[PDB]
Amino acid sequence: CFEPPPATTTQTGFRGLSMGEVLHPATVKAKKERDAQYPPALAAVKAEGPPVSQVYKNVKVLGNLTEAEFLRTMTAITEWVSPQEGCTYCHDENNLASEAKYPYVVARRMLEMTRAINTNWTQHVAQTGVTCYTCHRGTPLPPYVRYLEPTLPLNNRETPTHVERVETRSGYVVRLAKYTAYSALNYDPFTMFLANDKRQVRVVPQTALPLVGVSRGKERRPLSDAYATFALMMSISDSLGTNCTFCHNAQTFESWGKKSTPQRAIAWWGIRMVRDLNMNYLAPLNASLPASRLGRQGEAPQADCRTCHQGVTKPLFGASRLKDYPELGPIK
Amino acid sequence: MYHGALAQHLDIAQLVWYAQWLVIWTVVLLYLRREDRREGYPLVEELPYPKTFVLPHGGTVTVPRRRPETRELKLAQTDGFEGAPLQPTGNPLVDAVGPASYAERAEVVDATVDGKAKIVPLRVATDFSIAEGDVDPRGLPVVAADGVEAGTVTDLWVDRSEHYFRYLELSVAGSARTALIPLGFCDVKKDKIVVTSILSEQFANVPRLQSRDQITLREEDKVSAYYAGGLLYATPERAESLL
Amino acid sequence: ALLSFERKYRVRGGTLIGGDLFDFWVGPYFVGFFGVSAIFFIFLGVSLIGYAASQGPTWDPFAISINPPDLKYGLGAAPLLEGGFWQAITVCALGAFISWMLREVEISRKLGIGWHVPLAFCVPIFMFCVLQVFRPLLLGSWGHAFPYGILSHLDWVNNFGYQYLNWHYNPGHMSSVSFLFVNAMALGLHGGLILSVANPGDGDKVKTAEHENQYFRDVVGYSIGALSIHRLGLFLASNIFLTGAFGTIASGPFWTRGWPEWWGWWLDIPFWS
Amino acid sequence: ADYQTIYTQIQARGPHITVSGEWGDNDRVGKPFYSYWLGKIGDAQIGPIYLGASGIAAFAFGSTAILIILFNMAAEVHFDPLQFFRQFFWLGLYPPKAQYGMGIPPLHDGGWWLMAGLFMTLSLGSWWIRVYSRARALGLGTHIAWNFAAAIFFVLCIGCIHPTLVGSWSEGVPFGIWPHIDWLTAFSIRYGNFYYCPWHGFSIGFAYGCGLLFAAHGATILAVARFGGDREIEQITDRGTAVERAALFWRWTIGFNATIESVHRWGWFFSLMVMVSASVGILLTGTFVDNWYLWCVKHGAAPDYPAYLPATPDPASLPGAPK
Ligand code: BCL
Ligand code: BCL
Ligand code: BCL
Ligand SMILES: C/C=C1/c2cc3[nH]c4c(c3C)C(=O)[C@H](C(=O)OC)c4c3nc(cc4[nH]c(cc(n2)[C@@H]1C)c(C(C)=O)c4C)[C@@H](C)[C@@H]3CCC(=O)OC/C=C(\C)CCC[C@H](C)CCC[C@H](C)CCCC(C)C
Ligand SMILES: CC(C)=CCC/C(C)=C/CC/C(C)=C/CC/C(C)=C/CC/C(C)=C/CC/C(C)=C/CC/C(C)=C/CC1=C(C)C(=O)c2ccccc2C1=O
Ligand code: HEC
Ligand code: HEC
Ligand code: HEC
Ligand SMILES: CC(C)=CCC/C(C)=C/C=C\C(C)=C\C=C\C(C)=C\C=C/C=C(C)/C=C/C=C(\C)CC/C=C(\C)CCCC(C)C
Ligand SMILES: [Fe+2]
């Protein structure tokens, strides 16, 4: 029911505004240990030789590497994605140029997606970046994925209870609640805000008086938009393991400048990145993944904030493998 | 265009802000603060026009009161300073000064809604009784502040309008009289009524009633005030500093 | 200068400390040892606010703010303009609060009444201590306290509540809020009742204590009583901060998540999960 | 110490009193019974209670609203008795989520909400007749009735008046423990932080002010209960030393005082102003003010603070930023 003292507290705003983080050491310790499982970088290899675009038969993304450099990435990918199944999770053992297994054709699109994040979304991932492990955590199914409807538990490696199963209709409210930090907000902020770019997260006016033509009757947005924004902000806050004073001065949520922290702007690029990953890379994968991977509406698993963060403001507390695998980005 | 915008840089929510302050201070200073002045005014040593109540049992009253008689205070000033304290010239409990002071209430019996005497002993209110489980104080000794038995409880006086005991009546030991005491000045135990406001000998000068089975509004004031004056005057130490 | 019924009460005595030394009146105000110490801390406090405010960027009453130190200074001393001024004014505020309360005890004793009012005044002084001393001590820094400013301290209350996602779900908050509502409701009921009996309208007779209990037995089936509504009203009012003190001191020292999630002790019981 | 201020040491019993009203004496129902433990901190007699047409209409209209709410809640858990008892704090009846303006919304999206609120409005109005007529029947002033009306008015402000003034049933308060709580944050976010509504501060000062007043007044009457201060009606018409010492306590502390009558006018006025201030604030909200914080910024009242972490430009404003 209660968590013992002492607590870790930081300051994110001017003194006397009560802005900053409030952390529990025992929680942070468990996440630091869990995130320390990141396999260290593989050792450097010979830089001279032909490019695998010559050596091999069906290399389409990593063609400029040498053979030694290319088999290195093939080992790190296995360590990050399918370490227990080994090479044959994606490869016909008797012909490594065959695309006969569905994880092969998905892995190539993931190789392109990973380079895309590190090259086109540095406004967010910066120089830390992401590798296969950032999401997969050593399993082919990433632990924290979303479907077009709320699902429990949040960690798909955990066995669900009966009421937690998406088929049991009497537990819908709890499936909605736990994805919005236990609130009673009646909105699914993933499909609404993170699956695509259709809706507007901002709901507060930037004028002191009601502007004529958007302030009466059906000119108005419904107040349901304010709840939904609040729902996305409870899900954002929980998936990063933080509170809003990490980003807003609650004096004026809608105001930037001195009223917002530099992390709020990074968060803004994080929303534009999730939509790009969901719309252009992850959702079209339902034509390549087997029916046992799809959701009840034929959707492939998709990503939110928690896919990479898993309860920390920075994925893996900032651990990086960018300099060790340049073939993952940024791409010249 | 904006809803609520007016001339200049003015808006409607701005105007109501001035109106709200004007109404609040108008009610506070011009009404509530004048209703506060219906008693104790005018000062001695802005007022509202009189208010008249029609009493439930005949007659009227108009506040504040102008009594046909006023009492002579047995008090001596301690210094000529305008805000200097006064000092008793005799026995403050019987002279009724300071915490022993009573007000000049009407010498009438407080009445029930149907006209009967409101505060009466149980010997008159034979339809009343003490609730089952509570101590019946009749027949228990009254122990005063000095630890001496001041007397013995003879009856309880009940408020027939509210069903609430308000006094105990006790025979004063060695004085051939009975005095009333407000139950607030009584610590009711199973075998004794403890009273720390006054000493045993000071029970002899409790103000006496004109009638044995009724009490007036001023007699109730006189009886209550005598024990309260003992909080400060029962012993010389109670008027001094605690530390 | 004096009320028409005041002179017979203007006697000496009832003091806690000082004796006759400070036992006098200044106009209508009684003084006593604690009236002197009250003016001491108020003058000292108002001075410190004045000198600090002159150092600031504004004399606008809504914009002036005197804030505590940064979190990094902890519970130690802080530079005068970087949190020190706040430290001294806080000490002066407590001195004026406690002196005002003990002064009320002395006035109570001279009047021969109970000490109910100064005892009740300890409730808001205690809650002030929970915000500015007790919770900062548990959290480790004075910078966790609220600033002294008309509009700035609202921003403290705002960010504090949002630091825990949705402060409304704080269970100590729900109790403090429930008492705030019922007390303001009961004061309108009770104040309206007494005025309805004494002002029946037109030229009708003033009603009785029997009419009081009959009204509320008719409306709701129960009437608590004339004296009992005053014990109740003081109980309801006091429990605004008494129960609220729990939710404030638990936020941080005993709970670092959002308050909605605290309710998982119920929602996450395995036999209906 | 006055032990009577803590509890009733000796409780009295007697024949139960019945004061006749102009009408409805025959509509009082119930045999009174006496609780010993309730008698220690109040009157021991519970009941009887008056019925009447308005009190009956209140139960019928009100039970209708509550029945509509609970049924819709039971459907949210698909009529599972375990989950309903589990998730009860989270279930609710919501106003229309889509924007239909003032058109009566569908039953599955706000229609049941609007209908329960109608029956609740009829239930509140019926109860006010009871509160008002019972005072007239007993020859009492309507001081409680008009305080009650200000609370009913504020409920109408957040219930249907403001939704009508802005023209949307979506702005109304949902029914439910947590859901009606969640409305408070969405209604403050939407309109620019209610901490910057001056009527908000006015309603807060009076609400705090009722706490200060009943603490000071309640304690004052307890302190003068030794002199029958609780007998306040007769202390008004015939001043006793109880309210003389009470006025002089406050006169010697704060330099002024009230009367035993007028202190009730303060308390009745402060409670009334909690609702009057809150009503004017909701009526101005959305109709003539869209953002209370920027409204205070427009008039120069908002406080500003130095940057602690560096200022953060709006990235949507940057050149080449996505929509
Ligand atoms: C987003 C922000 C949050 C929020 C954040 C907080 C926080 C944070 C706190 C509260 C607390 C409180 N909140 Mg809030 N609260 C919210 C929503 C609400 C709502 C609502 C309708 O939604 C209500 C009714 C309330 C109401 C309440 C109060 C009942 C409660 C106690 C106030 C307090 O401690 O005062 C304190 C008052 C004092 C200390 C006054 C002391 C006075 C002294 C003794 C004398 C002063 C003399 C003066 C200087 C003299 C001048 C001289 C002149 C001559 C007069 N909150 C929202 C959701 N709320 C507190 C609490 O208890 O929470 C459990 C608390 O800590
Ligand atoms: C945890 C909860 C928060 C809190 C949350 C809020 C919120 C939210 C609101 C207020 C509001 C107010 N609060 Mg605050 N408030 C808290 C604690 C305090 C303390 C203190 C000693 O800790 C003080 C002095 C105040 C004082 C005040 C007033 C500025 C204002 C009206 C209150 C009122 O009517 O009270 C009841 C008392 C009376 C009716 C009697 C008269 C009291 C007068 C008005 C006091 C003036 C104080 C003024 C600042 C001068 C101080 C001394 C100078 C040195 C001369 N609050 C705590 C820290 N308070 C409201 C407002 O409008 O703020 C601008 C508001 O919206
Ligand atoms: C994030 C959330 C927001 C917030 C959102 C709002 C909103 C939105 C509103 C308020 C309002 C109020 N808030 Mg605020 N509030 C916050 C922070 C605070 C703080 C603080 C210390 O921080 C305080 C002291 C307060 C306190 C207050 C109140 C003084 C004020 C009036 C409401 C009230 O008393 O309702 C209590 C009284 C009632 C609800 C009346 C009920 C009367 C009826 C008759 C009862 C009927 C009972 C009957 C049995 C029902 C039967 C039902 C069946 C279904 C039939 N809030 C923050 C900033 N608050 C209001 C206001 O003043 O707005 C300008 C308002 O509309
Ligand atoms: C739960 C019970 C409660 C309750 C009860 C009771 N309330 C009482 C009593 C009882 C019983 C009294 O007997 C006593 C009194 O006689 O009343 C007339 C008193 C009084 N309640 C006051 C204010 C009050 N009560 C609040 C809270 C509750 N009260 C709750 C509701 C609030 C809120 C909510 O904000 C306020 C503002 C004063 C008017 C008065 C003390 C004067 C004083 O002590 O003077 C002595 C001190 C001074 C004159 C000023 C000292 C200035 C310092 C040194 C420098 C400034 C510091 C300051 C922190 C800066 C603040 C900035 C600001 C923006 C943050
Ligand atoms: C000049 C100088 C330095 C002198 C030194 C001596 C000295 C100590 C002086 C004190 C100087 C100071 C600091 C004065 C400030 C005093 C203060 C804090 C004044 C604030 C006044 C305020 C805002 C009070 C808020 C509460 C309020 C609205 C009260 C109005 C209604 C009243 C008066 C309620 C009090 C009151 C109550 C509560 C009763 O129950 C009661 C019962 C029967 C009769 C009368 C009363 C009564 O008057
Ligand atoms: C999770 C994905 C994954 C894992 C694990 C994996 N493969 Fe790969 N493999 C691929 C993909 C996708 C390609 C195509 C890459 C491209 O087109 O550039 C590929 C290409 C290759 C090729 C190029 C052959 C050709 O002619 O196209 C070789 C050789 C290879 N992998 C070897 C390995 C080795 C060695 C391992 C483990 C030790 C391994 N693979 C495990 C997905 C995987
Ligand atoms: C890690 C980042 C982050 C966290 C945590 C966060 N916010 Fe946000 N919030 C944002 C960003 C970025 C936006 C702007 C969205 C956009 O531009 O599309 C925003 C928008 C908002 C808005 C609407 C702004 C407008 O103009 O309408 C509100 C209100 C809000 N947040 C409140 C909250 C609340 C409440 C919480 C937690 C309880 C919270 N925020 C936590 C980053 C965050
Ligand atoms: C696919 C990858 C990915 C996703 C999805 C993602 N993050 Fe990030 N995010 C990162 C990485 C990597 C960093 C580390 C950047 C750094 O070290 O500064 C980061 C950093 C941040 C930071 C900066 C924290 C700090 O201390 O500076 C914030 C805030 C943030 N993310 C919020 C979000 C938001 C908001 C979302 C989604 C709406 C999100 N994250 C989802 C990869 C991701
Ligand atoms: C068992 C006992 C004794 C009691 C049971 C109580 C109970 C369990 C109830 C069930 C669930 C609970 C606790 C629900 C709580 C709901 C709460 C807190 C609601 C709070 C606020 C809701 C409000 C203010 C709703 C207001 C709505 C209105 C005023 C609507 C007004 C409508 C109109 C004017 C209609 C006119 C328009 C016409 C054209 C249709
Ligand atoms: Fe009263």
A118: nearest Cα among A128, A107, A110: A128
Q: Where are the domains of chain A?
A: 24-142+314-332, 143-205+221-313
Cβ neighbours for D142, distance < 8 A, ≥ 6 positions apart: C196, D132, D135, D136
- Let me know how many helices (H) and strands (E) chain C has, helices first: 10, 2
Domain C-terminal end among B67, B87, B104: B104
Tokens of residue B7, six digits: 């001339």
Number of compact structural domains in chain B: 2
Q: How far apart, in Å, are the Cα atoms of A137 and each of A34, A35, A77, A316? A: 10, 9, 11, 10
Domain D1-143 has CATH 3.40.50.300: no
Give B117's strand partners: B111
Q: Which residues touch C19 (CB under 8 Å, ≥6 apart)? A: B240, B241
Residue corresponding to tokens 């046909």? B68
CA–CA gap between residue B223 and residue B100 (Å, rounded): 9
Strand B129-130 relative to strand B119-121, pairing: unpaired
- What sign for the dihedral angle of Cα D314, D315, D320, D323? negative
- What is chain B's alpha carbon radius of gyration, rounded to the nearest angstrom? 26
Structure tokens at C125: 């002084």
Instruction: Give the separation between CA B76 and CA B89, rounded to whole angstroms.
Output: 6
Neighbours of chain C (3+ CB pairs under 8 A): A, B, D
Query: What technique solved it?
Result: X-ray
Distance from CA of D19 to the nearest CA of C (A): 7
The residues facing B143 across adjacent strands are B149, B194
Q: List the helix and strand counts (H, then E) for chain A.
A: 11, 2
Q: Would you kindly state where each structural domain of chain D is located, as residue ranges? A: 1-143, 144-302
Q: Tell me which residue has tokens 């008698």.
A: D39
CB neighbour class for B12 (10 Å; exposed up to 12, middle 13-18, buried from 19): middle
Q: Which of B191, B234, C186, A24 is nearest to D148 (CA)?
A: C186
**Bridge partners, residue D289, by sequence:** D285
CATH number of C256's domain: 1.20.85.10
D93 and D112 Cβ atoms separated by less than 8 Å: yes
CB burial readout C120-153, b (16+ within 10 A) else e: bbebbeebbebbbebbbebbbbbbbbbbbbebbb
CA nearest to C227, candidates D35, D39, B225: D39
Does any ligand 1 atom lie closer than 6 A to the CB of residue C24? Answer: no
Compute the CA torsion angle A234, A235, A238, A243 (nearest 10 deg): -30
Query: Largest Cα–Cα distance of chain D, in whole Å?
Result: 86
C-alpha distances (whole Å) from D13 to each of A99, B119, B166 are 95, 14, 13
SS (H, E, C) C134-164: HHHHHHCCHHHCCCECCCHHHHHHHHHHHHC
CB A34 near ligand 8, within 6 Å: no
Residue D310: closest CA among A250, A288, A264:
A264
**B152 burial level (CB within 10 Å; 0-12, 13-18, 19+):** middle
What is the dotted CATH code of the domain comprising A24-142+314-332? 1.10.468.10
d(CA D190, CA A227): 9
C73 and C20, same domain (yes or no): yes
Structure tokens at A252: 């004026």
Is D195's C-beta closer than 6 angstroms to any atom of ligand 3?
yes
Task: Give the whole-angstrom CA distance, residue D306 versus residue C141.
Answer: 21
Residues C137 and C248 in one domain: no
Q: Does ligand 5 come within 6 angstroms of the Cβ of C31?
A: yes
Q: State the ligand closest to the CA atom of A109.
A: 6
CA quadruple A88, A91, A92, A96: dihedral sign: negative
Omega before residue B42 within 30° of 0, cis = yes
Which element (helix H / strand E) includes C99? helix C84-111
Q: Which atom of ligand 9 is nearest to the CA of D73?
A: 11
| C181 shares its domain with C150 | no
CATH code reported for the domain at A143-205+221-313: 1.10.468.10
Q: Kind and range of the H or E element at A23?
A: strand A22-23
Together in a domain, C174 and C161: no
Task: Decide which of B104, B131, B148 is a domain's last residue.
Answer: B104
Chain D's closest residue to C188, CA to CA, is D268
Residue type, B224: S
Cα(A253) to ligand 7 centroid in Å equals: 7
Cα distance between residue C199 and residue A22, in whole Å: 56
Query: Residue C225 corresponds to which amino acid?
Result: G
Domain of C145, in residue numbers? 1-165
Domain containing residue B14 = 2-104
Tell me, what amino acid is at B200? S
Only one residue has tokens 């953002």, namely D291
Question: Which chains does A contact via 3+ CB–CB distances below 8 A?
Answer: B, C, D
Q: Which of C165, C189, C210 is the last residue of a domain?
A: C165
Boundary of a domain, candidates B69, B104, B139: B104
Tokens read off for C230: 């005053």
Binning chain B into helix, strand and coil, the percentages to the nearest 5 are 25, 25, 50
**Can you name the CATH fold of D144-302?**
Photosynthetic Reaction Center, subunit M; domain 1 (1.20.85)
What are phi and psi for residue B121, nearest 5 degrees? Answer: -70, 160
Give the dihedral of Cα atoms A150, A156, A161, A167; nearest 10 deg. Answer: 40
**Contact assessment for residue B41 and residue B54, using Cβ atoms and an 8 Å cutoff:** no
* Overall resolution, Å: 3.5
Residues B65 and B135 in one domain: no
**CA C255 to the chain's CA centroid:** 25
CATH number of the domain to which B238 belongs? 3.90.50.10
Q: How many domains does chain C have?
A: 2
Q: What are phi and psi of A176, to 5 degrees?
A: -70, -40
If DSSP codes are grouped into helix, strand and coil, which group holds residue B180?
Answer: strand
Backbone dihedral region of A225: left (phi > 0), alpha (psi from -120 to 50 degrees) or beta? alpha
A90 carries a ligand binding annotation: yes
Residues C242 and C157 in one domain: no
Q: What CA–CA distance (Å, rounded) separates D314 from D291? A: 19
Q: Among positive and negative, which fits the CA dihedral D150, D154, D159, D165?
A: positive
Q: What ranges make up the beta strands (E) of chain D?
A: 12-13, 28-29, 33-34, 45-46, 49-50
Most C CBs within 10 A among D6, D33, D140, hence the mutation to make, goes to D140
d(CA C9, CA D245): 8
User: Which two three-digit tokens encode residue C32?
Assistant: 């006593």
Please tell me the distance from the alpha carbon of residue A243 to that of residue C260, in angstroms, as a whole number.
Answer: 13
Q: Which of A145, A266, A310, A322 most suits a substitution to test ligand 8, by most atoms within 8 Å of the C-beta?
A: A266
Do C27 and C1 meet the contact criterion of CB atoms below 8 Å apart? yes
